[PDB]
Amino acid sequence: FTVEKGIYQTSNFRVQPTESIVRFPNITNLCPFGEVFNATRFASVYAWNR
Amino acid sequence: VYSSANNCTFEYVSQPFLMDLEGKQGNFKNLREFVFKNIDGYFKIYSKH
Ligand SMILES: *[C@@H]1O[C@H](CO)[C@@H](O)[C@H](O)[C@H]1NC(C)=O
Numbered sequence: 306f307t308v309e310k311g312i313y314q315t316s317n318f319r320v321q322p323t324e325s326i327v328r329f330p331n332i333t334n335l336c337p338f339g340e341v342f343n344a345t346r347f348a349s350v351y352a353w354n355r
Numbered sequence: 356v357y358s359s360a361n362n363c364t365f366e367y368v369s370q371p372f373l374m375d376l377e378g379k380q381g382n383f384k385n386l387r388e389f390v391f392k393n394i395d396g397y398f399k400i401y402s403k404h
Pocket residue numbers: 331332
């Protein structure tokens with residue numbers, strides 16, 4: 306109950322963030338994969354194109 | 356280099372590169388190094404001229 310002159314550490318100061326921005330891509334993107342849906346010929350079901 | 360292919364999944368085209376088809380017998384002027392690695396199914400290519 307009695308406090309003398311000096312410095313006493315009570316707690317810690319926390320700067321909580323206010324915003325949360327996340328950006329994985331920059332724009333729309335696509336790598337060539339339509340050849341399996343646009344091939345000259347397809348495969349059968351006994352041996353299908355994985 | 357081959358006769359024909361049967362079936363596959365991956366086909367990638369890199370950036371265009373120009374070459375000279377003339378062959379000579381003189382001293383070399385460039386050095387090219389390549390490193391090919393295979394970790395957990397991932398092929399790695401490292402190179403510098
Ligand atoms: C992402 O797309 C924008 C708009 O096309 C472009 O300015 C930026 O350079 C791109 N970033 C890349 C390709 O890393």
